[PDB]
Amino acid sequence: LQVCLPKGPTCCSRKMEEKYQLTARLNMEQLLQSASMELKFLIIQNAAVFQEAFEIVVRHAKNYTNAMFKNNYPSLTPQAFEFVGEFFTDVSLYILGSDINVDDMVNELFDSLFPVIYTQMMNPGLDINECLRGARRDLKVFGSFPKLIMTQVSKSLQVTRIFLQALNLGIEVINTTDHLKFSKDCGRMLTRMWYCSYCQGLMMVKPCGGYCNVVMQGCMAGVVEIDKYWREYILSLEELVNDMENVLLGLFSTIHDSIQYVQKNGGKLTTTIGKLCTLSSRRRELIQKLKSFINFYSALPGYICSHSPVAENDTLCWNGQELVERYSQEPVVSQIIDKLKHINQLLRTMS
């Protein structure tokens, strides 16, 4: 045998020892999953809800922009629908983490908007389209409106994108916890603590509380080190929640006023161009519920021992090798800590 220390005879062979080792692995994985399930489901629920809520906000804003174009500028439709759809599609793609340039969104929006304004509102009556697109930026026809919208929407969209990425990475690391493979020495120690008593013919004897403590603090020396970074993650997320619904909903007034602004100097513009050519409640409840799990990594060995059958009294218990009267006495973890450091820096820089 290679695990069960044979003091007397033994009722189990080497293959039964391998079976006990695999059952020890499975029991440890089940205990970790039971410890992490509530928090995993909490973060999954909140990620899904916030994603749907942000999509609802974007859809409502696209609908109102299209409706206000239909009502105030029928001469700009159906082209207005095209550039509004492209703008809000790129908005959603940026929110969901795709490489989209916010300044490029606004600039393409105004680049598409100006030629139809010129042809249908200012000078009624396809090849000259690019000359108008160039004149849009070269003559600064929209004034400071494009940069105002650019900063206004970049500020909110970046914080929302990083909020979603933080939720997803919390989901990722909490999923990773219950799949943590341990050392072979820890496998043998868990087999001794949980099952090797059966090899000595004992039926209901439980391991000592102190033996469970030394074993758990033995193989969770790395996992406990995650607690600092997990606490900093929670606190940085709290720093971030303390933005994007109000901004996207005022966009229509700003666009209407920008169109008025361009129409205001039509006299000179036409001649020059003719010559030249409940959310905040949800994130608050989420942070208040997330603060209840700040001790998750520090209380984890305590959980494994308090939910495994152990003799807390340290009397008439199994010490891994014999029944005693009184008890005598990286790589994946490194990746978890790396990702936590990354997300914590990213959080802190936002707020």
């Binding site: 159906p78 082209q79 629908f81 095209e82 759809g85």
Partner: protein
């Protein structure tokens, strides 16, 4: 049995321009569309005899 003369070709929406789908068969008395598993409302259909 009905033989289709003009079978519907996969359409593509460009710049939010709604493009209708064509269907022509003979001999036919009733022609209906089944978009994504379910029948299309009678009002949406425009028949030509």
């Amino acid at each position: 049995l009905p033989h289709f003369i003009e079978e519907p070709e996969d359409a593509y929406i460009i710049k939010s321009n709604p493009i209708a789908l064509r269907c022509k068969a003979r001999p036919a008395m009733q022609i209906f569309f089944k978009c994504n598993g379910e029948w299309v409302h009678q009002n949406e259909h425009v028949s030509e005899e």
